[PDB]
Every structure is written in C-alpha cells, then in structure tokens.
Amino acid sequence: FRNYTSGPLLDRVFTTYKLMHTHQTVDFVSRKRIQYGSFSYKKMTIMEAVGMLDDLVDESDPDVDFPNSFHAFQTAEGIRKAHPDKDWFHLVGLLHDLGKIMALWGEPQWAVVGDTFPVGCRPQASVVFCDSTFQDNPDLQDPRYSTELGMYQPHCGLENVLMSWGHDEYLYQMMKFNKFSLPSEAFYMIRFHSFYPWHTGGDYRQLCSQQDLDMLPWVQEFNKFDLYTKCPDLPDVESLRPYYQGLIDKYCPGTLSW
Ligand SMILES: O[C@H]1[C@H](O)[C@@H](O)[C@H](O)[C@@H](O)[C@H]1O
Ligand SMILES: [Fe+3]
Numbered sequence: 001f002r003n004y005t006s007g008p009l010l011d012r013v014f015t016t017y018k019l020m021h022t023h024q025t026v027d028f029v030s031r032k033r034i035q036y037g038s039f040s041y042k043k044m045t046i047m048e049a050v051g052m053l054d055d056l057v058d059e060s061d062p063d064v065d066f067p068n069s070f071h072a073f074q075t076a077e078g079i080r081k082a083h084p085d086k087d088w089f090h091l092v093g094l095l096h097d098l099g100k101i102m103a104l105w106g107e108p109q110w111a112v113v114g115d116t117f118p119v120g121c122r123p124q125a126s127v128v129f130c131d132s133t134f135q136d137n138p139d140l141q142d143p144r145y146s147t148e149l150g151m152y153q154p155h156c157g158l159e160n161v162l163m164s165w166g167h168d169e170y171l172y173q174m175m176k177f178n179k180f181s182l183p184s185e186a187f188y189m190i191r192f193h194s195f196y197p198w199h200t201g202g203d204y205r206q207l208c209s210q211q212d213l214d215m216l217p218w219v220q221e222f223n224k225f226d227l228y229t230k231c232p233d234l235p236d237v238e239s240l241r242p243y244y245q246g247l248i249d250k251y252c253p254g255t256l257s258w
C-alpha cells in the first residue's frame with residue numbers, strides 16, 4: 001500500500017518526516033505564506049513547470065524513486081481513464097504536485113512535499129511517525145498550541161486552518177492568483193491532497209466545517225489515483241503532451257506567475 005513499517009526507501013522518508021515535524025511551526029508557516037504568496041519567483045507555463053520537475057525526486061514518497069514529472073502524467077492518466085467525462089479533473093491530476101518546484105529553489109524538502117498537518121494545535125495519532133518525531137518542535141512546548149484545538153475554534157473550517165507549509169498550499173494560492181478557471185472542487189482537492197490524517201486517518205474533525213465534510217469524497221477519489229497510479233513503468237510523455245496542452249489551453253493558458 002504505502003508502507004511506513006517496511007520498505008527500501010523508508011530511511012529517507014523517516015528523515016524528512018522527522019525534520020518536517022521538528023521545524024514546521026506556526027511561525028514557519030506564517031513566514032512561508034508571505035515568502036511565496038506574491039508569486040514573484042518565476043514566469044512559466046504549466047508544461048515548463050512540469051518539465052522543471054524532470055529534475056526532482058520526492059524524499060517523503062516511499063512508493064517512488066524517479067522524476068516527479070512522470071507521476072504528474074501517471075496521475076492524470078489514471079483519472080482520465082476512470083472519469084472520461086471530467087476533463088478538468090484530468091488536469092487536476094497533471095497539476096496537483098507542481099508546487100514542488102519550491103525544492104528546485106533551495107527550499108529543504110520537508111518544507112515542500114509530504115503529508116500535511118495543522119500547525120498550531122496538537123498532532124493527532126494518524127500523523128505519520130507522530131509518536132516519535134515531534135519532541136523537538138518548539139510549538140509543543142507552547143501552551144497556545146499544545147492542546148487539541150490549540151489556536152483554533154472548533155469547526156472553524158480547514159480554509160481557516162494554518163497547514164504545515166508545502167506544495168498543496170503553494171499551488172492552491174498560485175491557482176487563485178492566476179485565476180485558473182477550474183471548479184471549486186479542483187482547488188479544494190489540490191489544497192488538501194496531502195492531508196492524510198484528515199482524508200484517510202479519521203483525524204482533525206474538530207477543525208472541519210460541514211463544507212469540508214461534503215468535500216471529503218472528492219479528495220478521497222482524487223487520492224486513490226494520486227497514490228495508486230505510482231509505477232516504475234512510465235508514460236509516453238511526448239505522446240500525451242498535446243492532450244494535456246489542450247486542457248491547459250482551456251483552464252490555465254499562457255505564461256503564469258509562480
Ligand atoms: O510522499 C508523498 C508526496 O510527497 C506527495 O506529493 C504528497 O502529497 C503526499 O502526501 C506524500 O505522502
Ligand atoms: Fe502531493
């Protein structure tokens with residue numbers, strides 16, 4: 001499945017989980033939201049950004065030791081074959097992990113990729129490596145953040161929660177700034193696709209609004225393709241490019257701000 005008890009990749013993902021749960025604090029996320037929130041680093045098309053990820057392997061992913069750009073196409077393809085009628089959703093597959101361009105810009109990987117969690121409240125039991133990787137996090141020594149709800153009001157809504165910083169929130173905010181013309185569902189899925197304690201573990205319902213609950217099956221449906229299309233046998237990217245460019249032209253055309 002996705003194996004955190006066995007695997008030939010488990011040490012590197014154990015390091016990045018340990019480093020991520022150590023340094024992802026309320027302060028850190030507040031800093032990074034500003035650092036990236038103006039989308040002033042680069043100008044690029046989707047396929048340019050996709051190609052940039054020809055240069056990136058994920059250290060938090062125990063299912064995968066090849067360029068992450070191949071996984072973009074694999075996820076897109078899996079979705080396209082299961083949901084022929086929803087082209088916007090094919091594209092969400094191609095797009096979802098494009099926020100990882102941040103690791104090519106010198107961000108450490110624990111600050112880019114990986115299962116997300118809410119920062120500013122106590123980590124819940126389904127956070128990977130929760131029992132063993134949070135003891136050097138300064139926020140857990142802070143009474144403002146060490147309780148179940150921490151800085152949050154019950155059922156505030158995930159859109160009102162400060163998530164540990166990485167690819168999902170970067171891309172969510174990117175797509176708003178660039179005004180992608182995808183459905184609300186698309187933005188939501190990308191923004192919370194890493195939030196495994198929530199969509200897979202049964203955790204963080206204290207923070208959920210009814211709207212979040214309603215979105216859960218969409219993110220669970222996205223997640224099964226994100227996860228299970230991961231395979232060493234790679235797509236014919238050159239073959240597929242025209243199809244995806246056609247969707248890019250419809251939903252998020254031209255040079256974009258990153
Ligand atoms: O190792 C994976 C990879 O980093 C994904 O892009 C991320 O969304 C997943 O949550 C993580 O588990
Ligand atoms: Fe991801």
Ligand SMILES: [Fe+3]
Pocket residue numbers: 071075096097226
């Ligand atoms: Fe992914």
Ligand SMILES: [O-]
Pocket residue numbers: 096097193226
């Ligand atoms: O992902």
